[PDB]
Amino acid sequence: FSLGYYKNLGVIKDTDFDRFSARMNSDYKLIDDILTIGQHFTLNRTSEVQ
Amino acid sequence: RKADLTGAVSVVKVDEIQKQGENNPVKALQGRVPGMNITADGNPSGSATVRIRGIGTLNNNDPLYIIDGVPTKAGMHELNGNDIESIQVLKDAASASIYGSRAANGVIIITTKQGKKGQIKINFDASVSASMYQSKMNVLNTEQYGRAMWQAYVNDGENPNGNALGYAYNWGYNADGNPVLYGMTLSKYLDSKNTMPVADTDWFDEITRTGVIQQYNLSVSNGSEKGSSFFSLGYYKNLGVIKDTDFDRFSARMNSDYKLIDDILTIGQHFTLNRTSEVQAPGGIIETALDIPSAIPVYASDGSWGGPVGGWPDRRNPRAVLEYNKDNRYTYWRMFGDAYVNLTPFKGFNLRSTFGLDYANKQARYFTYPYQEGTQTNNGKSAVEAKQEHWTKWMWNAIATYQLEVGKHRGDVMIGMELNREDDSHFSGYKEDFSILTPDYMWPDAGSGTAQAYGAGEGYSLVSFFGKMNYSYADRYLLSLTLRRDGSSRFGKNHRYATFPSVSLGWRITQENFMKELTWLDDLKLRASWGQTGNQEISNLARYTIYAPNYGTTDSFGGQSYGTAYDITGSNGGGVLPSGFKRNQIGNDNIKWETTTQTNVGIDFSLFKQSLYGSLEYYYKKATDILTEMAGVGVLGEGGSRWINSGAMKNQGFEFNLGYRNKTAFGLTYDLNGNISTYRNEILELPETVAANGKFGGNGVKSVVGHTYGAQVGYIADGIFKSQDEVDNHATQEGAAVGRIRYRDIDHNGVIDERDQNWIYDPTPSFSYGLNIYLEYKNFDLTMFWQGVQGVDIISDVKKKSDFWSASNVGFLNKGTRLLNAWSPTNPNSDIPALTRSDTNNEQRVSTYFVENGSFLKLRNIQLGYTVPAVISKKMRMDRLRFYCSAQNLLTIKSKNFTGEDPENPNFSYPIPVNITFGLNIGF
Amino acid sequence: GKSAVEAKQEHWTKWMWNAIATYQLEVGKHRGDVMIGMELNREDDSHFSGYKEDFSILTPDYMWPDAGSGTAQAYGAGEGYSLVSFFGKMNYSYADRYL
Amino acid sequence: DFKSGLRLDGDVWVNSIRLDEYAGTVDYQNKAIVVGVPYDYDITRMVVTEMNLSEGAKASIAIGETIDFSLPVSLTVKNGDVQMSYTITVK
Amino acid sequence: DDFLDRQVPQGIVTGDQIASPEYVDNLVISAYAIWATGDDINSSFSLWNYDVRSDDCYKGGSGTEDGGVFNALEISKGINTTDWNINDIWKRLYQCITRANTALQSLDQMDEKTYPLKNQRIAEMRFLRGHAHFMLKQLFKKIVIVNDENMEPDAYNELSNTTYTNDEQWQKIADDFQFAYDNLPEVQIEKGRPAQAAAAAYLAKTYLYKAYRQDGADNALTGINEEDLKQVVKYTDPLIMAKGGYGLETDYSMNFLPQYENGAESVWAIQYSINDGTYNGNLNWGMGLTTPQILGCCDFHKPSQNLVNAFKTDSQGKPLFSTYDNENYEVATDNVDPRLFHTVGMPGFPYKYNEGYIIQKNDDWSRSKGLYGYYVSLKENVDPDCDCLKKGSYWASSLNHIVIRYADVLLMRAEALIQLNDGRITDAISLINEVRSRAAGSTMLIFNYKEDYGVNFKVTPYDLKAYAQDEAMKMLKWERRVEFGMESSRFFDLVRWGEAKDVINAYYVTEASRCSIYKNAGFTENKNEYLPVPFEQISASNGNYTQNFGW
Ligand SMILES: OC[C@H]1O[C@@](CO)(OC[C@H]2O[C@@](CO)(OC[C@H]3O[C@@](CO)(OC[C@H]4O[C@@](CO)(OC[C@H]5O[C@@](CO[C@]6(CO)O[C@H](CO)[C@@H](O)[C@@H]6O)(OC[C@H]6O[C@](O)(CO)[C@@H](O)[C@@H]6O)[C@@H](O)[C@@H]5O)[C@@H](O)[C@@H]4O)[C@@H](O)[C@@H]3O)[C@@H](O)[C@@H]2O)[C@@H](O)[C@@H]1O
Ligand SMILES: OC[C@H]1O[C@@](CO)(OC[C@H]2O[C@@](CO)(OC[C@H]3O[C@@](CO)(OC[C@H]4O[C@](O)(CO)[C@@H](O)[C@@H]4O)[C@@H](O)[C@@H]3O)[C@@H](O)[C@@H]2O)[C@@H](O)[C@@H]1O
Ligand SMILES: [Mg+2]
Ligand SMILES: [Mg+2]
């Protein structure tokens, strides 16, 4: 499980870019490792003025 | 185990919740919680209305849902309900105050599934069901419609052959002179163009079908000493009984928790992703299907949609309406997440920081295909409407808790700071003049006509500082004190913040030494609580004098758009007209929090070694300074509506929960859960304009103050006139005649007028009860949940068009089948008024005739299941395996005084079907 | 003095389904892996925008299409595509020397 | 379970009629049969010779009836429980 | 702590900001536009819904139950003070007053030299407010005079309708028109704004209504005010209208044809526009219910056989004062005023001068299956191929709604002169003759009717000679009836004259033979000539509003 935040104000005025991110990965082994169920999900939100 | 342990807490059994197999767990718990009313129309979605402890406020009465510590008010039909560990209903202000500042109308805590320590498990559930239409409203066929029209004509004295609807009646007189109808004949085509042949059409059967429901859930959890995790995937689909209406939902939930540094630190998260796609039925589709006469064919001679022609009433084709609405599908994405961090510096101290997020997205595309159904048309209007909506709610929490176990005293002290921010926005584009007229082609770029753009945004913020203190002495005396300082962005700076205290006392009588000999009395607890909670659920722009530049681009029915655009030059438009501003509301800078004071007294008992358990509650709710939207005096004009603290509501209620579980000598395990509750609502104060206009009751005739919320004032129908002597003997009234409704003279003035009205409607049941029976015997489990309501009255709008002829908006509409048994000299033993073509007596007025006994008792759910024996399960290498067949809404009992059907849904809303379900559960 | 607002919305939805069957053999000094697979891809894109004119206050809070009092325009489009694939792979190793 | 059993599926069209020895033209839009006769012909004692209706249809007038056609004559064609009214004009 | 202050209202203007000098023209336009956008199908500012009580027209629709409250009003039986239509019309007229008052309050706080047209805008706002007050006074005898723009919203609860008597309320209404006449320009470049001539004409109308005194609790006429009559004459003097450039149109149908909007006779008119950027245009949605069944639906406001017989004339060109209603009008034998074919569309005749749409006595043209007759109103309707007609769930046209007509001004002057009886009866007869001559000449679109349907047109001016007061009054009443038929003023004229009870009872008795709707109809002497004050409003303003006499 990971949570990330990034923000960058550009050298040019009134231009910027920020990003929130959240990643969740998991894997499950079942029945003497015969079965496996895994997932990798990520959620990102980037707000930008170009 | 109750979270509060000293307040009004109801624990809901999630196993019996999932036994019903409903998309919405809230709808599943329809009658399993005392003092909690769930009303569900029955649409493919699980959308339902929840009222806890009756109506407690004039503004929004929805309860507060808290899923994994994240407060929300959105419905649970749009989330996954098959991954819930526990459901707790907090109905007391003192107990539920600490969970949020929006706990005025009750709180529902939902704890989702988490990986149990030291094991890994998986569960796959499949379910397929068929939903059938049961409350098929009976309407006149072609012959019955002709007979009713002839009866009305001969009763009124006009010539039935002058109906000009293609009916030719062969009729005569009997010995007594009463008209009789020997036979009838019909013209083949309803029009002179020979395009609309006459037919006997079952419109309800045409617009209804057999719906299919399919549910597939796959959950898997894994726990350990260093952490745990859980992952669930769910799919639900429901085709409604009404054609071209459906609702499907995909869901994916991921939960995890991690323990670090000798369990000093903890990091957890609960996230869920949902995608629901729905096509909804058009408004009043059932009403249109009932109204349209059965003589209209579904299809014309050339294959186009059939429609009224000539003198037939102007009602659209319901089948064509559904066919055109089948493309109005909306997609809804829900991102409901939470991340928390917990730190324990030492044994008693805990610091928890929680961040919650609730992002909602809605994308829809509504089409307006040209239609021409006989004389019903929109002049070939083709249009498209692309709409987008965003809801973003984020919550931050900080909780510091300390626990002490000195001597026999247990002391918990908690402080907390919470921030909430909600931002909503929406925008839509509208385009016209399309050519191909298909969903693929209909896009705003492809449009070649007038374009419109709409858009709005709003939001609010909440700040809360709360404190809680719990003290326990000898594990026998319990005291709880909480304080809350709440502020909202909806109020001015002077009245931004408010303070709410709450106190709770509890006494475990069974722990006292003076009844140690009472072995049968396993446990007995007496608790009381007095709490105050705050309400601010009002419009975001409540304290501002709103002036809006309403140009007039919004569609309005009847032309009362109240727009601001005038051709001041006088050139019939041809360009951008000058515009301006209009007042929407008058600001009020003195609005403050609504204060709700709740007093609760409860007794919990457990007898015979936890075999017979139960609880009895009595509650008094008093809401004061209610924020209400009082309208203008009338000469103040538009924008006179304003928010004011001039309300007062009272709710006295009793609740009784009982349960008995025991075994049997030959191996039968029976579990009975009983429930019964009652309440009384009363309005004590109200603004003068509100009382006059009767928005909350009284129909604008008498003030609702001192009466139940929603009570109605109308006339009293004392049977019907059966002879001219009776008509003369009765007090004079306009339109009185033989076979007409007789109205009681309340004031004995000799004339029926406005003053002859009294209180006739009370939407408060005498008591609502529920019963759950669970029988286990030789791997066979039978579950049976009944729900009943007694002493409730309902205003029947269906009676308006099923008991009268020409009492609707327009004449010659289709009516109910029971209209045939109307009073006549040939049919004296009847109570339905005689048919007539003109409402001279004004029978559309509110009266006791339309008030019926809504009491009912329906088998909400039945389910028979067989579990594969454990030895066969282990031989086949999978865990718990179960098959089941269930029926929902299979059987119901209604009072004989109810002329209609389905007392729960006695109006033209969406019907409630009977569900027959077959399902299986596998544990591997 | 042209005052206008442009509210734009775009959606991209791509979903992929995969099915892979793999077998491995370690007979003698020969290592043999055989894999077969079926893949489906579907992409659907859409976008729509509203355009409004003739505003008065000229601030982001006030500038909304409802608050606009001028000519309005609407734009919108949608597209997509689909992919189907059937693939097979075979790996042979002899003496851990020839691949 | 809902149908009234009125037997509304019958057809009431009129294919063609012949008065004496003069066939008539039928317009279904206005339900009008027009029979053209010579100017000196006497139409006060016309005789119906044939009337080809639909299957199962029954008309008010019978084949072989003597009618005075100095004015338009109304005709009703009935099939089961449906009916249609035509007007016959001899010009 | 800016957390609770960061978010602000979106897309709105606050009350403190709405008083800025740059929004005054916007508020003026809002007050103008309420008269075109603030009306409903059941509550139109033309008041045709509430004019069905007269003998001019019935109520259309499927039947009696279609708009049951309006059927109760039409039959004058079973009318309740708790009527949604009555409450709605009260609320809508007071909403118009509220917009005008807001504009006036904004205007009053501006600098004269900074805003040169301040007085003109104030005059226009006072004119609109007075128009709304006049309409309210016509509908309800006792009304609240809201003429204080600088008045707090909290003080509105103390307003009462008995603060001023009937004469005082009429004077308060006329004061606004006096100010408008004083301050308005003689000619307006924008046809939407009223002119000085329009203000003067409407002031003359107010003074004419004030002249017929209704002192006492009952609604009975008490006398005629010579001072008010002289004021009417002074403000209807032809010099004012000559300066304003207003006069009778050369043809009667030019007033209602869309091609001749804002004509000479259009003294003032609500401007309705099409395809002007809104959802469907500022169309006349109040007339939406009056479109014929050939357009698909609605079909309300059907004229009456009594009105057709009134239009019927004799062989000398004068209206039949005593035998007009004995027999129904016959197209082939009876001389008819040409105004009938512009007002009422009879069966067998082109609909709105369109040969492709011939009105027939079948169900395709009457929704009620002959219950309300088959006649179709034509003044408020347009040609189906006009391109000024649009379907916005109700067929509505961009045709302007004329409120004041030069014909109305002339007939008002004639009424004032006749009631004065100071030797100007000859002048009144001259005005009536002018109107009749205009009617006679108005045959530009129906000239072919003589050779197409055998229609005999015969209308002649009255002979100029000495006339008795009662004879002149009867002739004027007949001229008003045949001129403003279907224009929603017959009932108000009857109430003002005081013969409303007798006329309505006679109409009920006469029409009960040919219509079964009037079987139980009955008019009360001192109750049914004014709408009751709404019960909801009376309850809301407790101890402040008094119900009208007889209720
Ligand atoms: O009196 C009942 C309640 O209405 C109140 C509310 O305070 O005031 C009346 C209120 O209603 C308005 C509507 O703006 O006028 C209604 C009034 O107008 C009359 C003439 O006086 O008739 C109007 C003509 O319009 C027609 C259609 O051309 O009828 C409209 C009729 O149909 C409706 C909905 O009807 C139902 C109700 O759900 O839905 C189906 C479909 O009609 C019917 O079976 C039901 O009756 O809408 C018409 C449909 O067209 C659509 O645009 C899409 O198809 C949708 O809008 C609807 O689905 C309603 O608009 C209305 O009921 C035509 O038949 C009539 O001749 C009169 O008949 C009617 O009473 C408004 O002016 C007024 O303010 C209160 O009095 C009271 O509480
Ligand atoms: O105009 C209101 C009137 O129309 C209806 C349906 O025609 O609502 C339309 C508008 O309701 C909105 C605004 O809240 O949302 C409701 C619909 O969206 C759904 C999607 O799941 O619900 C979303 C969200 O809204 C609640 O219903 C209210 O809090 C919550 O229960 C739920 O979580 C869907 O359930 C609703 O149909 C907006 O999206 C529509 O434009 C009627 O609802 C209403 O009477
Ligand atoms: Mg009484
Ligand atoms: Mg115009």
From TrEMBL, chain A:
UniProt subcellular location: Cell outer membrane
Residue ranges the record marks as coiled coil: none
Homology family: Belongs to the TonB-dependent receptor family.
Name assigned to this protein: SusC homolog
Organism: Bacteroides thetaiotaomicron (strain ATCC 29148 / DSM 2079 / JCM 5827 / CCUG 10774 / NCTC 10582 / VPI-5482 / E50)
Automatic annotation (TrEMBL), chain D:
The protein's name: DUF4960 domain-containing protein
Species annotation: Bacteroides thetaiotaomicron (strain ATCC 29148 / DSM 2079 / JCM 5827 / CCUG 10774 / NCTC 10582 / VPI-5482 / E50)
Residues of the full protein shown: 27 to 117 of 461
From TrEMBL, chain E:
Record-annotated disulphide pairs: C297-C298, C386-C388
Domain RagB/SusD: residue ranges: 265-551
Alphabetical UniProt keywords: Cell outer membrane, Membrane, Metal-binding, Signal
PROSITE patterns: PROKAR_LIPOPROTEIN
Broad class of where this protein is predominantly found: membrane
Domain SusD-like N-terminal: residue ranges: 2-208
Molecular function (Gene Ontology), one example: metal ion binding
InterPro entries xref list: SusD-like_N, SusD_RagB_dom, TPR-like_helical_dom_sf
Binding positions (Mg(2+) 1): V52, S54, Y518
Cellular-component GO terms for this entry: cell outer membrane
Database matches in SUPFAM superfamilies: TPR-like (SSF48452)
Binding site for Mg(2+) 2: E261, Y272, S398, N400
Subcellular localization: Cell outer membrane
Family: Belongs to the SusD family.
Name recorded for this polypeptide: SusD homolog
